[PDB]
Design a protein around this nucleic acid. Structure first.
Length: 199
RNA sequence: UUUUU
């Protein structure tokens, strides 16, 4: 190895990606299938934003019942969300790409729908959506004039501590069985007692 | 990776 010199560390191409966002190769196998849904060529970020806006109020699980007709084309959201659930990228991974834009578009104006009953205090309610780690990412699509306001520390602590509570609501309903068969599960649906409801 | 109902 040639003991890197100054000219080499002065002629570096700065370029950052992240595995929390869908790979650049996956951003094309989505656009090519969107136009295949008769979607306009130029207006391809609008339809994706109109889905990020829906996952901002209901969530980004793979089990989210996406319902609603788009107001920008003749394509329904369900077939947009089902297109984006292909080629490997998860829905949440996709909404993470536009998180910095939905931040500007909706913060301090309209909170996520499911915060009154997701464990968020009223002051830190605008981080009440998953994929909130999309603004902690300089790789996601950034808004023209930067973010409206940086997330506060309270909001981050909340999104962290509430991310773990939900994981101990999903992982506390399933089992540590590694097979759905009737010989391993023995019929038991869950593998853990009601330590999954009480404190 | 897992945050819906």
């Amino acid at each position: 190895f040639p003991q890197v010199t100054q000219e080499q560390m002065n002629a570096f191409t700065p370029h950052t990606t992240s595995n929390l966002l869908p790979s650049p190769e996956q951003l094309t196998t989505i656009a090519n299938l969107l136009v295949a849904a008769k979607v306009p060529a130029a207006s391809t970020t609008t339809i994706a934003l109109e889905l990020v806006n829906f996952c901002y109020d209901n969530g980004s699980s793979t089990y989210t019942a996406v319902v609603g007709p788009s107001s920008l084309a003749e394509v329904s959201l369900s077939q947009v969300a089902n297109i984006v659930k292909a080629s490997g990228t998860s829905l949440r991974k996709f909404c993470r790409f536009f998180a910095p834009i939905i931040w500007n578009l909706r913060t301090d104006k309209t909170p996520p729908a499911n915060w009154e009953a997701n464990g968020f205090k009223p002051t830190e309610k605008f981080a009440a959506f998953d994929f909130f780690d999309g603004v902690e990412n300089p790789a996601a699509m950034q808004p023209p004039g930067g973010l409206v306001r940086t997330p506060s520390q309270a909001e981050r602590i909340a999104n962290a501590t509430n991310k773990q509570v939900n994981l101990f609501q999903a992982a506390a309903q399933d089992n540590n069985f590694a097979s759905n068969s009737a010989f391993i599960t023995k019929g038991q649906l869950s593998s853990n007692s009601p330590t999954i409801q009480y404190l």
